[model samples]
Target chain A: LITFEKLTAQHLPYLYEIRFSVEENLLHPHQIQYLQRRQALEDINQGGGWICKHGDDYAGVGFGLFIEPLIGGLFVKPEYQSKGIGSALLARVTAWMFERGAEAIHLTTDPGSKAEGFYQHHGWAVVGQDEFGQAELVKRK
Target chain B: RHMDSLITFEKLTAQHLPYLYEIRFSVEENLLHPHQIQYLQRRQALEDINQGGGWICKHGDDYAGVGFGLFIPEPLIGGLFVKPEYQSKGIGSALLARVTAWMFERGAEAIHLTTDPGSKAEGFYQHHGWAVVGQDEFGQAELVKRK
Candidate 1:
C-alpha cells in the first residue's frame, strides 16, 4: 500500500535520492538549486515537503514554501513515475498552499512538457515565463 | 571616517549577479563549495532575490559586497560576502544589518545561518549579538538572532 508523510529532517537523504534520480527528466534546470533544497528541508517550521512511500520504498516528493506561496517542486523516481505518486504529492502540496493562505500557488515547469501538463491537469494554469523562460504556473484557490 | 558610511546599500537585481558571484568565489577563508557554482547556477540568483531577498553594496562605482537570504521556511542567510579588498571595512556589518532588518520586516521571528565553527564568520556573528545556538547537520555552527 502507498502512504504519505510530511517531510522531516531525517528524510533529507532520501529526498536527495529522488532528486538525483530524476534530475535528467526536468526540462527546466532551475526548479531546485543545488544548495537551497537542503536549506529548505532543514527549516521545519515553515512550509514543507510531502513524501510518498510505497510500502518499504520512497517513491516521490513534493515541497512548498509559505513565502512566495511557491511549490518548490514535485518529483518521483523514473521507475515510479507512472503511478499516481506525482499527482498525489502535487495535490498534497497544492492543498497545503491553500491552507497556508496562498491565494494562488506558483510553480515553474517547462512549457510543453508533461510536468506542465500534469499541473494543468490538476487546475494549474500557465501564467507566464519565469526568469529563465520556463512556464510559470499558477493555481488559484 | 566611518568605513560604513563610504559604502552604499541598494536593492540587488539581475545586474548584480555577476558581481555578487565574484565576491562569493573570491573568498579564500571560511569558503563554501562546490567552488564551481555561480557559472550555470547563477540563473537561480534571479529567483532568489526576487522571491527571497538580497542586497548589495557599492564602494564608489565598484560592487563591494552582498548579503542575501531566503524569506520562506525561515530567514536564513545564503551568505554575506565582501570582496577581498573590501574586507576590514564595515560593509559586512552594514549589509548584515540591512538584510536582517529586511527579513524581520517581512515577519520573521528569528533569523538563522550556518557557519563553520571557529570560522571568522562565527566570530563576526558573535561580535554582533548573534548566538551559536547549536550545530547543523554538518556540524557547522547554527547561529540565530532575535529581537
Candidate 2:
C-alpha cells in the first residue's frame, strides 16, 4: 500500500538513500556533498519536500527550493519505479512552488533520457543544455 | 543614450565604495532579492576583483556602471550593473571588457558568473561570449567565458 507524506528534515537520510540508488541522472560525489547542508534542507515553509512510502518504507522523494523555485532533487527507489510515485511527488512540489509566486520552476535532467521525457510530459520544457551536457527544463505558471 | 566610447573606465578602490552603492541602489532591473542586500552589505566590496581591480564606468560625469570580479577560488564575476539611464549604450559591454581581460591577464583560464535566467543580462552576457555552464542555487544561469 503506497502512501504519500509531506517530507520534513527528518526524511533527509531516506531522501539520499533513494537519491544514491537511482540508476540514471546520477550525481557525482562532489554534487552529492554540496547539497547535504542541514539547514538548506530544513526549511519547508515555502519550498519543500515530499515522499511516498510503501506502507512503511520510503519509495520516492521529491523536493525544490521554491524561493529560487529550483528543483533541488527528485528520486525514486528502483523497486518503486512506474507506480506513479515519481509523478505524484513532482506534482506536489511544483504546485506548491507556483502557488507561492514562482513564475516558473526549473530543473536539470539527463538529456535524451526517459527522465527528460517525464519532465516534458509534466509540462516542463527545455530551455537549453549546460556545458556539462545536462538539459535544463522550466515549467511556467 | 550616451556614447559608450566616451565613458571613462576607473578601477575600484576603498574610496569608490560609496559611488559603487549609488549605481547599485539605482538599478531598475535585476534588483537585489530578499536577503540579497544584506548579503551584499555583508561581503561589501573588500574581497572583489581577484586578478585585478573592479571597474566603474562613467560618461564623463557620475558613475554609470560597475563590474566586480572575484576568484571564488576560481575566476568568478561577483556582480555587474549599469545604471538604468546609462544602459543599452555599451557601457555595460565596456565594463565587461575591462574586468574579463583583467581575469585573463591574472592567470584565470575561464571566468564564471550567475545572472537571472531569461533576463536581459543573461542575453547580454551570451552575446559577449559567455557560455551557459550550469544553473546556480538562486535559479540563475551560471555562465562562463574563456580567453
Candidate 3:
C-alpha cells in the first residue's frame, strides 16, 4: 500500500531485489552485503532512516541518517524510480528535523548519483562539489 | 555503583528466533527508504542463518541479545542487529567486544563489518576507527578493522 515506515528484517528480501536489479558497475558484492548489514544496525538503535512499501507489496526502499539539526545521506532502489517516493521521503525527513529547529541539513552525493537530481528538485542546492562528491545542504527558512 | 551485571555470552539457537524476531520488530520502521525492504530481508535472513551459534547476551531467564558471528570459515558477513529497545544499554558494544574477543581467541588476523554511505551507523563504525578504505557500487560503504 506504499506505506512509509522504519526498516525491519522482513524487508531485506525486497532490498536484495533492488540491489540485484541495479546495473553491475552501479554496485558491487560487498556493497550489497553492507546494505543488508546496516539495516540491522539501525534496527537495533531505533534510528529512523530508510523508507519503504508498494501496492500491497514492498517495492521500493530509501535510506537516511539522522544528525541533530541535519538529516543527511540517502539512497533508494531502482524500479520505484520517478514515483515521487524519494522526494516524499526527503520532505518527511527534512520536515521532521526542521520542526526541531535544525540549522541546516547536509548530504554528499556522487556527482553522477541519481539522487542528486532528486534532492535539487526538492529545494536542496549544491553548496560544494569536489572530487570526493557533491555536497548539498538545505536550511529551514 | 554496584551494577554487578555479569555479562554472559551464549550462541543463538533455534530457541533464539523468538528473541531475534522480537528484536527485529523493535527496529526503527523508518531507517529503510522506499521499496528496499526486500534487500533488507534477504541480508537479514542470511545474517540470521549465519548466526551459527555466536555469542548472545542473557539476562537470567530470557535472551537479552546476540552478538556477531565469528565462525572461522564464514565470510564474516556483517549483519548484526539488536532489538531497538535494547540499544545503548551496552548490548552493541558488549556484543562487539565479545565477538572480537572470540575472533582474537581463535587467532584471526582481523574482523570487519560493512555499512552504507547513507547509514547513520557509518559514524559509529568510524568513531571506533572502522575506516572506509574502499567503495564498490554494490553498497555505499566498506569498513575493516585489523589487529
Candidate 4:
C-alpha cells in the first residue's frame, strides 16, 4: 500500500538512489555525485518536498520551497513509471500552494521528454522556455 | 451531458501539498480523524507516479477534493477525501471514479482500501460496491472492489 510520510534527513540516500537510477543516462557521474553531495540536501531542506513510499522502499520525492510557488524537484523510481505516483505528487504540491494563496506555480522540464507531455496533460500551460531550451510550464490558482 | 465538462481534474503535484494539508487539518467539517489528517506525510506524499499517484478535482479553479491510488506489489486505493463543503454534490464520487478508472486502465484486476470501520465512509465505499475483506491491527476495516 502507498503511504505518505514527512521527509527526513534519513531519506537522502534513498532519494539519491532513485535519482541516480533515473538520470544515469541523462547526467554524468561527476554531475550526479555533485548533485548528490551538494544540492540534494539543500533541495530537500529548501524545497520542503514529499517522498513517495512503495511499501518499505522510498520510491519517489516532490518538494518546493514556499518562497515562490515553484517545484524544486520531482522524481519517481524508474521501475514504477506510469503508475500515477507522479501525478499524485504534482497534485499534492499544487493543492498545497493554492491553499497557501499562491496565485500561480511553475516548473521547468525537458522539452523533448515525456515530462512535457505529463505537464500539459495535467493542465499546465507552457509559458516559455528555460535558458537550456527546456519548456517552462505554469499553472495558476 | 455537459455536467462532466464543469468538473475537470488536474494531475496532483507537489505544489498542492500545503493546501491539501491545510484543508484536511483546518477545515472543521472534514470527517477525517486527527490521526488521519495529522500524520499525513504532508511533505512527501506525491513524489512517485509509477507505483501509483493521485488527482485533484476542480470546479472551475475552486478546491474540491483529491483521490489517490497505490500500484505496487498490489493495487490499493489510497485516500479519497473531498472538502467538507464539496461533499454530497458528487465531487467525492467523481474523484473516486477517476482514480478507479485510472487503476483499471492500467491493469488493476481488483482495488483494495482500508478505512475506519465505524465511519460513514465505510458505508459510502460499500455503496460504491466495495466489500468487506478483513481488518488491520488498528481495527480499520479493509474493503475490496474487483474489476
Tens-digit lDDT string for candidate 2 (B1-147): 445467888887755554565566556567655434333331334445323548888877767788877776678887788878788888888788878887788888988888778889889999999999889787878998987
lDDT of 4 by residue, A75-140 (tens): 787777788888888888777778777898988777757887888899998989867576789998
**TM-scores, all models, native as reference:** 0.49, 0.47, 0.41, 0.46
Angstrom error at residue B37, model 4: 7.2
Question: Higher-TM-score candidate among 3 and 4?
Answer: 4
Candidate with the larger lDDT of 3 and 4: 4
Superior candidate under lDDT, 1 versus 4: 1
A-chain TM-score, model 2: 0.89
Q: What level of docking quality does candidate 3 show?
A: incorrect
Could you give candidate 4's per-residue lDDT for residues B29-134 as a string of tens digits?
3244434422243223544333446777776766577778888747887677776666777877777888889899999999998887867778998998899999
DockQ of each: 0.02, 0.01, 0.03, 0.02
Give, for candidate 1 chain A, the lowest lDDT window spanning 10 residues.
A26-35
lDDT of 2 at B88: 82
Report the C-alpha displacement of residue A60, candidate 3, in angstroms.
2.8
Q: Model 1: which docking level applies?
A: incorrect
Q: Scoring model 2 with DockQ, what do you get?
A: 0.01
lDDT of each: 0.73, 0.73, 0.54, 0.68
- Candidate 1 — which residues are off by over 4 angstroms? A1-141, B4-6, B34-40
Q: Report the lDDT of model 1 for residue A19.
A: 54
